[PDB]
Amino acid sequence: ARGPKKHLKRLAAPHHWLLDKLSGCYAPRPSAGPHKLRESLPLIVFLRNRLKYALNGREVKAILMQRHVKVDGKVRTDTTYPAGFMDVITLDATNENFRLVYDVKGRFAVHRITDEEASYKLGKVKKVQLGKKGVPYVVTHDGRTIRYPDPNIKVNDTVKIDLASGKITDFIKFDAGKLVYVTGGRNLGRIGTIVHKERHDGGFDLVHIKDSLDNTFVTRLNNVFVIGEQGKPYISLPKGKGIKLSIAEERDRRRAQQGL
Amino acid sequence: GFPMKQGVLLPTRIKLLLTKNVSCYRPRRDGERKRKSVRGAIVGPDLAVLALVIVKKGEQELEGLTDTTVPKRLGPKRANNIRKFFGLSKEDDVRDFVIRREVTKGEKTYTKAPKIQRLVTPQRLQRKRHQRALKVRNAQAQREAAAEYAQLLAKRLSERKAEKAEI
Amino acid sequence: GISRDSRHKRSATGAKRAQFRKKRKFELGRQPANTKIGAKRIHSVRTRGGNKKYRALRIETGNFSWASEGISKKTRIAGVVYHPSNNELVRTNTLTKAAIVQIDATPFRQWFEAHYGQTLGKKSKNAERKWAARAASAKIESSVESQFSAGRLYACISSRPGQSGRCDGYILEGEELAFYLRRLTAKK
Amino acid sequence: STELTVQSERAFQKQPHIFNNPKVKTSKRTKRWYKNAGLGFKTPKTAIEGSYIDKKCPFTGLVSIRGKILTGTVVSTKMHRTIVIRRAYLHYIPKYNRYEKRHKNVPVHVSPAFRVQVGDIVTVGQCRPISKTVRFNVVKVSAAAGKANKQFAKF
Amino acid sequence: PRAPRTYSKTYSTPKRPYESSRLDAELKLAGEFGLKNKKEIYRISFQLSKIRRAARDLLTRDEKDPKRLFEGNALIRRLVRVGVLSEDKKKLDYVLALKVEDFLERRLQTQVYKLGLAKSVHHARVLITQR
RNA sequence: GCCCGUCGCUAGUACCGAUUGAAUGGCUUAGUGAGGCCUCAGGAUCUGCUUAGAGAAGGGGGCAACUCCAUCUCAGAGCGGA
RNA sequence: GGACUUUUACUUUGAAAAAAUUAGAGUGUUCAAAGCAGGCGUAUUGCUCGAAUAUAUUAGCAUGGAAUAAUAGAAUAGGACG
RNA sequence: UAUCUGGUUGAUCCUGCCAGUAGUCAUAUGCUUGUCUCAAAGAUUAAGCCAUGCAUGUCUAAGUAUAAGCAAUUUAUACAGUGAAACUGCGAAUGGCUCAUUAAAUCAGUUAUCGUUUAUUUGAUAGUUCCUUUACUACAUGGUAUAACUGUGGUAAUUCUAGAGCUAAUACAUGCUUAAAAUCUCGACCCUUUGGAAGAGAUGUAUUUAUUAGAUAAAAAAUCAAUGUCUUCGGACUCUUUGAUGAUUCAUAAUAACUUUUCGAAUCGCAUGGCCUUGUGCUGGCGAUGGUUCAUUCAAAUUUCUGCCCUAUCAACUUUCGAUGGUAGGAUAGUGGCCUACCAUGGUUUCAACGGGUAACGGGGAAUAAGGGUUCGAUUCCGGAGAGGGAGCCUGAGAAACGGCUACCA
Numbered sequence A: 001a002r003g004p005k006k007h008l009k010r011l012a013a014p015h016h017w018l019l020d021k022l023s024g025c026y027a028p029r030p031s032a033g034p035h036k037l038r039e040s041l042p043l044i045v046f047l048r049n050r051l052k053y054a055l056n057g058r059e060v061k062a063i064l065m066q067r068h069v070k071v072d073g074k075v076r077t078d079t080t081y082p083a084g085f086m087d088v089i090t091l092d093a094t095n096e097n098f099r100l101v102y103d104v105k106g107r108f109a110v111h112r113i114t115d116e117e118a119s120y121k122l123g124k125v126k127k128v129q130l131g132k133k134g135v136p137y138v139v140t141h142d143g144r145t146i147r148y149p150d151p152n153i154k155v156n157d158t159v160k161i162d163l164a165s166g167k168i169t170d171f172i173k174f175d176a177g178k179l180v181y182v183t184g185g186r187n188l189g190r191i192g193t194i195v196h197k198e199r200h201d202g203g204f205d206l207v208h209i210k211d212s213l214d215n216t217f218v219t220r221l222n223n224v225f226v227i228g229e230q231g232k233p234y235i236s237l238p239k240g241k242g243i244k245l246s247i248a249e250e251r252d253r254r255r256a257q258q259g260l
Numbered sequence B: 001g002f003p004m005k006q007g008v009l010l011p012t013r014i015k016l017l018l019t020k021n022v023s024c025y026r027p028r029r030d031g032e033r034k035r036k037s038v039r040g041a042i043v044g045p046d047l048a049v050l051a052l053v054i055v056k057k058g059e060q061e062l063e064g065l066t067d068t069t070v071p072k073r074l075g076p077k078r079a080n081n082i083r084k085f086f087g088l089s090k091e092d093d094v095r096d097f098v099i100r101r102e103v104t105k106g107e108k109t110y111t112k113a114p115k116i117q118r119l120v121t122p123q124r125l126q127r128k129r130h131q132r133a134l135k136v137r138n139a140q141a142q143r144e145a146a147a148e149y150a151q152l153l154a155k156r157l158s159e160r161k162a163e164k165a166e167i
Numbered sequence C: 001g002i003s004r005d006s007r008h009k010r011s012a013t014g015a016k017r018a019q020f021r022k023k024r025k026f027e028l029g030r031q032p033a034n035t036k037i038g039a040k041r042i043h044s045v046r047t048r049g050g051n052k053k054y055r056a057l058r059i060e061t062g063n064f065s066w067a068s069e070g071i072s073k074k075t076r077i078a079g080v081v082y083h084p085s086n087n088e089l090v091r092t093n094t095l096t097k098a099a100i101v102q103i104d105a106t107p108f109r110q111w112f113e114a115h116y117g118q119t120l121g122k123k124s125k126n127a128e129r130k131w132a133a134r135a136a137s138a139k140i141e142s143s144v145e146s147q148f149s150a151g152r153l154y155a156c157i158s159s160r161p162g163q164s165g166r167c168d169g170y171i172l173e174g175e176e177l178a179f180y181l182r183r184l185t186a187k188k
Numbered sequence D: 001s002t003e004l005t006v007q008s009e010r011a012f013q014k015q016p017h018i019f020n021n022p023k024v025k026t027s028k029r030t031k032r033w034y035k036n037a038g039l040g041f042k043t044p045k046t047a048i049e050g051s052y053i054d055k056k057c058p059f060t061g062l063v064s065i066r067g068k069i070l071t072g073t074v075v076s077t078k079m080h081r082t083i084v085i086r087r088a089y090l091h092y093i094p095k096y097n098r099y100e101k102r103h104k105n106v107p108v109h110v111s112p113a114f115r116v117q118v119g120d121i122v123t124v125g126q127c128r129p130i131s132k133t134v135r136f137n138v139v140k141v142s143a144a145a146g147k148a149n150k151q152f153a154k155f
Numbered sequence E: 001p002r003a004p005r006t007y008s009k010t011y012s013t014p015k016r017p018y019e020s021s022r023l024d025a026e027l028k029l030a031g032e033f034g035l036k037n038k039k040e041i042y043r044i045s046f047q048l049s050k051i052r053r054a055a056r057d058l059l060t061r062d063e064k065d066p067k068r069l070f071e072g073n074a075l076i077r078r079l080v081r082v083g084v085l086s087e088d089k090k091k092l093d094y095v096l097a098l099k100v101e102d103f104l105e106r107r108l109q110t111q112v113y114k115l116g117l118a119k120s121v122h123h124a125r126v127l128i129t130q131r
Numbered sequence F: 001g002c003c004c005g006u007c008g009c010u011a012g013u014a015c016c017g018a019u020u021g022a023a024u025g026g027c028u029u030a031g032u033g034a035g036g037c038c039u040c041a042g043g044a045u046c047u048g049c050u051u052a053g054a055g056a057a058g059g060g061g062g063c064a065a066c067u068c069c070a071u072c073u074c075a076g077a078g079c080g081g082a
Numbered sequence G: 001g002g003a004c005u006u007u008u009a010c011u012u013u014g015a016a017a018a019a020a021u022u023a024g025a026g027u028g029u030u031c032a033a034a035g036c037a038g039g040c041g042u043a044u045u046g047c048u049c050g051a052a053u054a055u056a057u058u059a060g061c062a063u064g065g066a067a068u069a070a071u072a073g074a075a076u077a078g079g080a081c082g
Numbered sequence H: 001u002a003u004c005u006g007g008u009u010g011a012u013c014c015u016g017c018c019a020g021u022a023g024u025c026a027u028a029u030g031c032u033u034g035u036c037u038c039a040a041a042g043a044u045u046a047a048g049c050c051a052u053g054c055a056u057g058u059c060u061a062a063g064u065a066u067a068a069g070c071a072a073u074u075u076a077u078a079c080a081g082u083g084a085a086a087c088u089g090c091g092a093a094u095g096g097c098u099c100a101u102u103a104a105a106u107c108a109g110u111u112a113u114c115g116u117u118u119a120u121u122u123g124a125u126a127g128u129u130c131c132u133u134u135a136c137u138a139c140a141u142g143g144u145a146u147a148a149c150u151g152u153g154g155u156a157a158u159u160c161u162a163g164a165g166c167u168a169a170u171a172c173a174u175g176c177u178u179a180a181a182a183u184c185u186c187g188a189c190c191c192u193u194u195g196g197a198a199g200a201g202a203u204g205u206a207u208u209u210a211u212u213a214g215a216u217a218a219a220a221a222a223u224c225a226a227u228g229u230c231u232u233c234g235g236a237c238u239c240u241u242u243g244a245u246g247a248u249u250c251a252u253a254a255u256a257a258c259u260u261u262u263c264g265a266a267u268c269g270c271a272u273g274g275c276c277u278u279g280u281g282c283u284g285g286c287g288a289u290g291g292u293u294c295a296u297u298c299a300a301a302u303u304u305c306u307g308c309c310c311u312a313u314c315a316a317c318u319u320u321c322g323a324u325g326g327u328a329g330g331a332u333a334g335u336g337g338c339c340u341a342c343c344a345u346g347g348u349u350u351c352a353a354c355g356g357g358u359a360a361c362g363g364g365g366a367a368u369a370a371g372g373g374u375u376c377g378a379u380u381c382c383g384g385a386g387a388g389g390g391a392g393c394c395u396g397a398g399a400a401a402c403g404g405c406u407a408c409c410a
Helices: A043-050 A057-065 A247-254 B063-067 B079-085 B122-166 C106-115 C125-133 C142-150 C175-185 D045-049 E020-033 E039-059 E066-082 E100-104 E108-114 E121-128
Strands: A069-071 A088-091 A096-099 A125-130 A136-140 A145-147 A158-161 A168-172 A179-182 A196-198 A206-210 A216-220 A224-229 B013-018 B034-039 B101-104 B109-112 C042-046 C052-056 C061-066 C071-076 C079-082 C100-103 C153-157 C169-171 D069-076 D082-093 D098-109 D121-126 D136-141
Touching: A043 A057, A043 A069, A136 A158, A158 A224, A168 A224, A179 A206, A247 E066, C071 C106, C079 C175, C142 C153, C142 C175, C153 C175, D069 D098, D082 D121, D098 D121, E020 E039, E020 E100, E039 E066, E039 E100, E108 E121
Parallel strands: C061 C169, D098 D136
Antiparallel strands: A069 A088, A088 A096, A125 A136, A136 A145, A158 A168, A179 A224, A196 A206, A206 A216, B013 B034, B101 B109, C042 C052, C061 C071, C079 C100, C100 C153, C153 C169, D069 D082, D069 D121, D082 D098, D121 D136
């Protein structure tokens, strides 16, 4: 249709942003970046709609232009910046450090971390290819292009990044029995160690997963992100740790703690 | 009121396709062409005005022409243009020969000179120096990282020889 | 202009196809170069997303590779003498891929006489060591050397002249050369 | 289909960039290249033995099998190096809660490695646009000849 | 270009137009409770009729079906919170029973009377509506 | 008792029909073909690189012979560009 | 990793799956159509529950079934395994 | 939320339609109309025609200020505050509107690019640019030609512009540069062995061609042509390097070349200091804009499977002037009869082709509540198409754009 779309009609905007059906008309269209449109999160929805640090999007823009926010180490002035998974939100004033990881509902959750944890990133390798001048390279889910990796790193493995520097430090391979975070589908936001990989050549490898409640589910290799060992992630999970309570269970819990 | 146009011939009006960077037409948008009327370049009775230019002066002074003289409103702004209006050789410092313009702010006559561009300056030399410096630094950087991967691969090969020695 | 869509043109079933939408810029084609021999004239064409194509119209010199000798020189293209698509390209000496032309031979002569010390058709100590080291490698081939006598070498174009502005190609050799040999005389 | 003459075109049929040096006296004349489709598809003997050319061959040509893998019944082999196959099916209609016999004739390339005949059930693999109608390539002959010789003569 | 500000209606309307008996009963409810519209009855009888529907559909489900459990019990607790469903009869077979009168009797209209403050449902009306 | 058709009057609808009747729309033969785009030529002017003269400038460093780089100016000849 | 496999329909579970819309949970917009809010204290420098679930069939993928109903095979043995 | 009722008879039971009844995010219209909230709205007919206004522009300490601009002051005799105009850059290819065409088209659910283009954002990425190569080529930085402006003007008339005179660049056109190493060729000589060598040239990246490497299906041998590293001088060669995909002639690499030569910084802003051999020597901080290639993101272009309303008073259709396929080429960003040439005779059809109709844009959907259905969707989201009708095209990463141009018709 004659060229690049510049607007986003608030109604087509991804639901996991939790934007109200009315009041307004448009949404922030995530800038070009390290993350796909429908799995990012603009700074404005985070600062304003997720953190209540703002009301007018204009005020968000000001706040931001004041260099307060910084993502993964760089200041960032983009109002509708495509911040997404594993990214490190950093407020030097207020002394707050955030990491963007999924709920169990499927949304991005407000998660407060250490100042120490906020100095290294996790990154699922999406591809690893030989480069020009014979220099091999790995590229992870967030478009991070790191050269000279370990000759034992394949696709779908996961990786620990410096943030303050570029070098990959530690890495975990995609084996059976690995604490895995589901990043897509409606089984997303859950966590559960991996069971077994349905192969299928040239047509979507299915991944069999099991959480710490002996609940099982499948997905596809795409939505699967490796994050560690049994009971031993490499990042700070949030309240619930991807176990998915049924409607009746949730009903029971939220009306269990009820004594005013 | 239609304008002539050098190189059409015909002592008559013709309608041509006019483009960027060509007479009797200034565009209003990128690559905007327009078909406009234009008078020929051959003189005739239909001409209201004839733009002529003196090549040689006769034996008589013409009133508001030969008798009088107007100034070239501006002066040399680039470095070597200044160095060539007078011809100075890249030596005599250009910052004195820049024409300065007086202008009386009522009871405060002022002195304003251009802003010499293409001038070789300290800060330019500093930036240049930084270019070459940074370039070489990253060169050796990438070289040493290359040596590093060379080592890792080498003593990985060594661990493959060691492992193949185990079994 | 020239559209390369498939939206015109009958369905395989047969039916006439309606006119959905108008001509789009991206489905465009452009005119053939129809490139010929002699004097360098090449026009750059602006394509999609920048990227110039080079369109040779008249070309005199090209880069030709002697496949089995490991070398490649730059010679003057003498003339088209065969073409599998259209005979009209031969009568017109129009330059195009897969066209069979005759090149100059003399730089290839100079190289071979300077490399083997043997000379086609029909002193320095180090160079003697080399020319002696070689041989059992100077057999050429009947058809290639016979080709060398007349001083014109049957070559096959492999570059796209109306595309790259280059008229490169290889020398004919073996089964291929035999084919175009039989073919090129049996129609004369 | 093809058959005979191999070099029966105005141009010279040769596999691209498969140099066979004249000087180097070989006893096979011509150097042959080939690969494997994948997905389980055994590259037939007649493809590596043979001396055809077909750039639209999955096993020796310049195409790649990827996407859909279908099967069908050969209805047409009248053209050259290409066939038409009828894929039948049944269509569910809700209001009546019943089915109806439908079909589609898919155009598909067939390499001179195989030897097809009308009736042979065949397995094809989707490739790139080969022709005006062709997006599939015959990749396995599941049938045979429908017990042809089993209609022989008296005694 | 904005979102649809959704809506719906809250009343149905009798199929037969002039069934004298139903007119009698409807009238009785009106005068007894101090309603100005037959609509005020229709409304209720529609609301109720949706409940009952949701009820029937659950009753066909298998006992201890997750949806029957969660939603059925949710509906039940809902019909209790107001004052229509008794704590005695409290397992969605009475919600298949029920009647309009039980809904009618729970209005502020009805309560601001039934224990004094009014002496008539009409004085209840006039009081309520007058701030 | 009921009842069928020709025939007669008022209203309405549709059919057949000289006019080889008319109107709109989509396709379309043949002929004529504007226009931008491509291409062979064109050269109002306006410079370009190469060859050499006539007057000064700046020195690779010398007692005389010796000798490079940048710039500008007019009789005059080759190789191409806009 | 090497070597080959008669083809189907049916049914199950699952994945892949925008929102709004519908069905529907929670929250007293004073009620209500709605909205996705809100609720709590130290109401002088916080506390905190959410923003569910379901349907989403035909075709394509994936997985379990082996009744029903088709299909192919060893008779001029040109058969089966070794 | 599974209901009927009035009308053929003298009366009866039927058949059967007419009429009654109820709703419609369903239009209109009529009579009446007081309060709160919510707020659809020139779609239907005429994608009919339109007066006037407005709806697209845009500047950071950081490309270009000698406004004969304003402000003055706080140093500022190159400039520096602030800033009209003009240049340059990006944007105007989104938005908004309409439903005219469109019936295997669009759309949808599902796919593919081992079939391509992509501004941007994001992460990566660059020591080679000169030349018989000591009496040297600006790099302490090479060339003009222009607007604005001044001034002279033309027409009834426009966002019309002519002749003259000035002047900028991150515009235009040029054009130097930096380490070590090694690999290939040639090769002066010296000297016969089995042969080894001073020093001359080439080797950034991109582009075009040819060639080679890119192993791995479990394990061993002889010979010919070349010819490598170490001699324990008969000879051995031992450890030997391997990425990815289901799949490649893939990524990546080497050889011989090729090119009216792509790129490799003649740019800007704040600070202004280190270190002496005291040369305006040599260094040195922060980030701005740019710059080739790869990745990323936003895209786009095509593309597999299956699914559309009425119609037989449409049964055969398709190849004129491509219809279905093979070869080669051309053209494209690229796949392909997309086009050309040669060649063949193919392609669809009662499982309904082809043709006609549609008051037909497709979908999410909507109305109607026993179920199965019936009916509808121009219209707040998504996809497509158009800008009075047609074609053509410039600019550009992206348009066959119309609040762009060109031509024809109205």
